[PDB]
A paper describes a structure:
The generation of cGAMP by cGAS requires that the enzyme bind to dsDNA and use its two substrates, ATP and GTP, to generate the cyclic dinucleotide. Our previous structural studies have shown that upon dsDNA binding, cGAS is activated through conformational transitions resulting in the formation of a catalytically competent and accessible nucleotide-binding pocket for generation of cGAMP14.
We were able to solve the crystal structure of RU166365 (hereafter as RU.365) in complex with cGAS and dsDNA, allowing us to better examine the structural basis for the affinity of this inhibitor. RU.365 occupies only one side of the cGAS pocket, as does cGAMP in our previously reported structure, leaving the remainder of the pocket filled with solvent. The benzimidazole ring and a part of the pyrazole ring of bound RU.365 partially stack between the guanidinium group of Arg364 and Tyr421, which represent the key intermolecular contacts between RU.365 and cGAS. The angle between the pyrazole ring and phthalide ring of bound RU.365 is approximately 120°, which is mainly caused by the interaction between Cys419 and the hinge region of these two rings. The remaining parts of the phthalide ring face the solvent and form no interactions with cGAS. The benzimidazole-pyrazole and phthalide moieties of RU.365 overlap with the adenine ring of ATP and the α/β-phosphates of GTP, respectively. The entire RU.365 molecule overlaps well with the AMP moiety of cGAMP, with the benzimidazole ring of RU.365 inserting deeper into the pocket than the adenine ring of cGAMP. There was not a large difference between the affinity of RU.365 with and without dsDNA, both being between 64.1 nM and 98.5 nM, respectively. Taken together, RU-365 appears to impede the binding of both GTP and ATP to the enzyme active site.
Numbering used by the authors: 149 to 505
DNA sequence: AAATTGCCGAAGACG
DNA sequence: CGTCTTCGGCAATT
């Protein structure tokens, strides 16, 4: 039953090929545009992130995330209040002549300025694209992404995400995050935390407005590693190892949410990342590959449903990397919203998930 | 040195 | 289930 739904969600190779060919042409052209002289973003490098590059994208290959990461040396971070995720950015000594001089605000590096110039450079390059149907989606507050809309003639979106790369140690609000010691282990955890961290220009929402200079922590690179290296046994899902159903559970939960979101706008505040975060905790909670045997698919899905409902009910979903940050706090999602999503989930759970059709 | 090339894991396709 | 395939990611190389 759940296998038959997975078959439907599975992407088709001809679709992948058609989408990939077009997406790669467009992105590689922006990247090189960004590589150009006079640009502030001259040293940006590409990093592919998100559902598609983690092999957890469902239904159609119609959404692509790409991080244009910029190695910015020597930055001091100041925690924006006690959020743990959001930050103001200063430089240690002024870099003499600085490519990012123009994005400054006294001593603070404005995310809004830097994104706006990034967006402007992308918009100008996209207008020059003639062989392909592409446009830049209207800017949306609360988004670090400059979003492309491609008609291939299939509708494809590409989120291009400016990121600052910092090679220093991770900010202390992450110090008790990534609790993978009993699962992927301490060598993996330590090694992952020796990798750079990223800031993306998603602004903290003060109240009714955004704080235009703030940045947000991104662990999209770390998450991608984990999705590809997700078992306690090194050979999980390898050619001389056992297949598990961890990713299949993520896809089923992703689908259940996306179906509910399509017809209920009371659910607009929720999104895939809530689901991904929840399954990260599941994987931590049940680290043994044996617990995610494909034959146990139904009960792993139901256990994930159960955990998620409990997160809704208690209004608490800890960010996996930043445990202070509650993705289900009253302040980000109203109680009523969470209670709405609960009853719909419970209903689909006690009725054999009719919405899967 | 920006771009090509070589390698192979992840996973779709098919019997 | 096995085998074949395309895509993605890496970094050595020219
Ligand atoms: C609600 C949400 N949070 N979120 C998110 N919060 C983070 C905090 C710290 C680090 C990464 C985060 N990603 C995140 O990626 C989303 C969804 O991704 C979005 O771009 C988005 C947009 C509208 C609603 C929900 C989301
Ligand atoms: Zn596995």
């Amino acid at each position: 039953k759940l296998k038959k739904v997975l078959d439907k969600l599975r992407l088709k190779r001809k679709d992948i090929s058609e989408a990939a060919e077009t997406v790669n042409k467009v992105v590689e052209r922006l990247l090189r545009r960004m590589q150009k002289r006079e640009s502030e973003f001259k040293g940006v490098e590409q990093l592919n992130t998100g559902s598609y590059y983690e092999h957890v994208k469902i239904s159609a290959p119609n959404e692509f995330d790409v991080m244009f990461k910029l190695e910015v040396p020597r930055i001091e971070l100041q925690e924006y209040y006690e959020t743990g995720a959001f930050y103001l950015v200063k430089f240690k000594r002024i870099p003499r002549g600085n490519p990012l001089s123009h994005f400054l605000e006294g001593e603070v590096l404005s995310a809004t300025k830097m994104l706006s110039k990034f967006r402007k450079i992308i918009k100008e390059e996209v207008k020059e694209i003639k062989d392909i149907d592409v446009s830049v989606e209207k800017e949306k507050p609360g988004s670090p992404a400059v979003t492309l809309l491609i008609r291939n003639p299939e509708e494809i979106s590409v989120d291009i995400i400016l990121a600052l790369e910092s090679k220093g140690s991770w900010p202390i609000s992450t110090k008790e995050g990534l609790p993978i010691q009993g699962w992927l282990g301490t060598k993996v955890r330590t090694n992952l935390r020796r990798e750079p961290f990223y800031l993306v220009p998603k602004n903290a929402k003060d109240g009714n407005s955004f704080q235009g200079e703030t940045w947000r922590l991104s662990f999209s690179h770390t998450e991608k590693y984990i999705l590809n290296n997700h078992g306690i046994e090194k050979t999980c899902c390898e050619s001389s190892g056992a297949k598990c159903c961890r990713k299949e559970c993520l896809k089923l939960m992703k689908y259940l949410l996306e179906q509910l979101k399509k017809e209920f706008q009371e659910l607009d505040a929720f999104c895939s990342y809530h689901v991904k975060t929840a399954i990260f905790h599941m994987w931590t909670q049940d680290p043994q590959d044996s617990q995610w045997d494909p034959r146990n698919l139904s009960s792993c899905f139901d256990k994930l449903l159960a955990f998620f409902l409990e997160c809704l009910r208690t209004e608490k979903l800890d960010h996996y990397f930043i445990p202070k940050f509650n993705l289900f706090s009253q302040e980000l999602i109203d109680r009523k919203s969470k209670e709405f999503l609960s009853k719909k989930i419970e209903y689909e759970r006690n009725n054999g998930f009719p919405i899967f059709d």
